[PDB]
């Protein structure tokens, strides 16, 4: 079967066929999300992703190769097949390379690159082109809360009026301070017990997260998950740690009004 959606990525911008041209070889880029046909992507059971009747195509299968639109019947078969890993990557199976936005700006051209699980490599296939705004409820039914740039995140009693408990879940798989959307939940390293803080969004692997089906919030590069340190909310420390399924690693999003 087939179905059509937008594809939201870095900084909440959308995958867009540049200038709305359908000529073979036209690059894909980031552009602010809308309803224009050059942002509407049809996913077919043959693993093609189509816009304006043509296919998302790797113009080469090397690190740094450009991704373009191209006639689906004349492109190389290997170059038009894509899958959508549950962590939000868009992968070309033949090469193993993944769709990447190398800069945050509008008009950045999308490339196939080595998978480093970067936030620049995160995408969401959806008709809602706005970030989802939610509280993140965890251990002891408390809420995850921001506390400024460079500072730790930590747990507090949930309050409908606390803006610092309000998170924008962006299409690039970043978790952002809703009121200050240039700031990202960031692990301060990839090792167990590294602290989770807020830092300027930079596309990094340390800023990419995945909400899995076991109630964990996973950092794909490290493999490790958000953890209320020592099950002790008074420490005011959230770390990354291996997944245990314990109550201090369970989370659920609660959509905000
Ligand atoms: C695949 O392409 C990437 C983008 O060109 C390479 O990473 C980039 O390497 C640049 C130096 O050549 C570096 O200044 C860029 O910031 C970096 N981009 C990022 C953020 O990944 C990548 O090169 C590998 O990784 C980089 C960071 C260095 O460690 C290089 O020595 C590595 O070769 C390319 N991968 C390969 C396998 O060449
Ligand atoms: C993809 O490239 C194909 C090969 O060049 C195009 O099919 C060819 O379209 C020609 C111009 O319309 C037509 O004279 C040829 O007979 C046909 N060739 C073959 C081998 O089918 C194709 O065009 C689409 O498909 C054809 C069948 C017609 O329906 C066209 O009007 C379609 O545009 C190219 N696809 C696209 C979307 O451009
Ligand atoms: C989250 O932050 C967003 C962005 O600042 C807030 O959305 C703005 O809200 C005002 C008032 O309703 C609107 O007029 C703007 O159009 C909104 N902007 C955007 C870009 O969406 C939002 O209210 C915040 N809180 C929640 C719960 O979503
Ligand atoms: C939790 O952390 C606080 C703050 O550091 C500390 O005073 C308290 O003793 C800890 N509780 C436990 C059970 O370790
Ligand atoms: C480069 C761009 O120019 C304008 C269009 O509305 C976009 O969808 C985009 O393609």
From Swiss-Prot:
2-gamma repeat copies, ranges: 222-249
Disulfide bond entries: 14-33, 55-72, 143-158, 184-201
1-gamma repeats: 95-127
Domain of life: Eukaryota
Residue spans of the 1-beta repeats: 52-92
Residue spans of the 2-beta repeats: 181-219
Repeat region (1-alpha), residues: 11-51
Glycosylation sites: 63, 71, 178, 232
Swiss-Prot/TrEMBL 2-alpha repeat ranges: 140-177
Domain Ricin B-type lectin residue range list: 1-126, 129-254
UniProt-recorded name of the protein: Nigrin b B chain
Portion held of the full protein: 306 to 562 of 563
